[PDB]
What we know:
The structure is cut from a larger assembly and holds chains A and B. Chain A is an alpha+beta fold.
Amino acid sequence: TIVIRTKKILVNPLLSRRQLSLDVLHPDSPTASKEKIREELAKQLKVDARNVVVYGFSTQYGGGKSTGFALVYDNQQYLLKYEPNYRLRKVKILGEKPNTRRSFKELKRKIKRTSGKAITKLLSEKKGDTWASVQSKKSDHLKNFVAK
Amino acid sequence: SKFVEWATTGLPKSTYRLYVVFGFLDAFFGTGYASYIVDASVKALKAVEERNLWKRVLCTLAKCFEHDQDGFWQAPAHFGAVAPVLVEQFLRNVNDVIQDVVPAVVELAAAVESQEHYKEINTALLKHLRNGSPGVRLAVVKCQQAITAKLGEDWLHLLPEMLPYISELQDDDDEVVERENRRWIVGIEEKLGESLDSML
């Protein structure tokens, strides 16, 4: 199978995590799937898989070696507060990313031309996804998850 | 019918019984048959000492769980007699039988799902949670685990006792239970979620 060598590692107590460079050796098989790399790593570190997030990879011009960077968080409860909204939909935890631009630009249109009376109403119709909403969803992953 | 009569005659008035006879029954065991089998299975559980005989029957119940499932009547009809025989076994008997008993509860639970032995079993597990070698521990952890999966139903109250059971184990420094304890923790995570807080 694969052979991973961990390369450059820092210790960030601030965001409570350790950052490391990864060098996957797959001489034979094609680039490793982030997923599979996620676990062969968690095993060498001996840490829950979901508390280890791996991002950015490459693949030297045909040679079976891929470089990448990963993250080790101690509390998935920390990981959930720090990681980016986009990395979460990626583990299928946060979800969708609907097209805000267009409509938001159009509401600006109406609102900029009204008095408070209606404005409030309009606002009660701008494409969802509040941050207040992002949190409640983040929170639910919090309680409902426990293990390792 | 005739076979049962001879075996019954063998009992302490005059062993063939638990060891060889039970083993034979186990073989025949390995749903249509379940009604006919019931009394014989019952005898096997009852004869604690033909311990080996008892172990074989207890083991058979587990096998019946996997084959029959809900049909097994763990939730259904068959369970009610079996659970009290099993419960009685604990109540009254080689120590070695009990661990097998505790794991069987798990297999029974997996099959039945929703049926209500829970108060008595979980409590029994609690007392057992206290020692008897790791043999008992492995068994207790196993019983919690199939109970947790089996339901996909209640048990939340117990999670804090269970993890603390695991915690005590952690200090102990001795192995087979480790695998079982790990299996339970993963199972808890799936059901409960938030159990991380207790772990931390």
